[PDB]
């Protein structure tokens, strides 16, 4: 698809067979999700942003649909405001910035 | 353009006469920089993100070139860990995510 920036761009992801709400996020490295489980180990990570860092727990190679496109990679869990999509699988999808 | 996003997308933009490097960032409801001087009106906003929120001031209708292409929009000046331009400007540079 093309996404305009008018509106936020929401998409809807699955993960863990479950439907999400996320945000096509450019200026995020990783991604991030709210609190949910995911299966294995966790590593720490500590993530920073505009009002200073949080931390959050890592998985590796987990599998996640965004907008129908098959990701299989690193997803962070912990107190962010809002689902985010970051770079790492927004490149997995073959997203691009376009004007 | 078409930016990968392999890396950071970073960009050269003009603004008060000053030539900054930020990122072109969707999940940014607002364009964000650091401290800098702007003239005319402004009003204090508190904006959040990973790790809460910070104390801006509000400018409105500010000129900004962006890879060549002039824009006029709404800029934020504080605390921010870094610059970034966001769907308030990107919008008027014609700026879509494809994939
Ligand atoms: C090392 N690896 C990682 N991975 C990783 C992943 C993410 C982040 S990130 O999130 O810090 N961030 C890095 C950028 C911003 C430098 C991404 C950025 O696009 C955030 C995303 C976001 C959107 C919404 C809320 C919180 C964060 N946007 C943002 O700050 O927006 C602010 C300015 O404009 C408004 O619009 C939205 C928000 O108000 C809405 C709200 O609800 N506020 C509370 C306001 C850092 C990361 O580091
Ligand atoms: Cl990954
Ligand atoms: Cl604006
Ligand atoms: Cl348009």
Same mark, same amino acid.
Request: charged share 20%.
């Given at each position: 698809?093309?996404?305009?920036?008018?509106?936020?761009?929401?998409?809807?992801?699955?993960?863990?067979?479950?439907?999400?709400?996320?945000?096509?996020?450019?200026?995020?490295?990783?991604?991030?999700?709210?609190?949910?489980?995911?299966?294995?180990?966790?590593?720490?990570?500590?993530?920073?942003?505009?009002?200073? &860092?949080?931390?959050?727990?890592?998985?590796?190679?987990?599998?996640?649909?965004?907008?129908?496109?098959?990701?299989?990679?690193?997803?962070?869990? /912990?107190?962010?405001?809002?689902?985010?999509?970051?770079?790492?699988?927004?490149?997995?999808? /073959?997203?691009?910035?376009? &004007?």
């Amino acid at each position: 698809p093309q996404i305009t920036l008018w509106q936020r761009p929401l998409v809807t992801i699955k993960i863990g067979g479950q439907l999400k709400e996320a945000l096509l996020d450019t200026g995020a490295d990783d991604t991030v999700l709210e609190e949910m489980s995911l299966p294995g180990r966790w590593k720490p990570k500590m993530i920073g942003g505009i009002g200073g &860092f949080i931390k959050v727990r890592q998985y590796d190679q987990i599998p996640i649909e965004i907008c129908g496109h098959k990701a299989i990679g690193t997803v962070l869990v /912990g107190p962010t405001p809002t689902n985010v999509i970051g770079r790492n699988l927004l490149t997995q999808i /073959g997203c691009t910035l376009n &004007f």
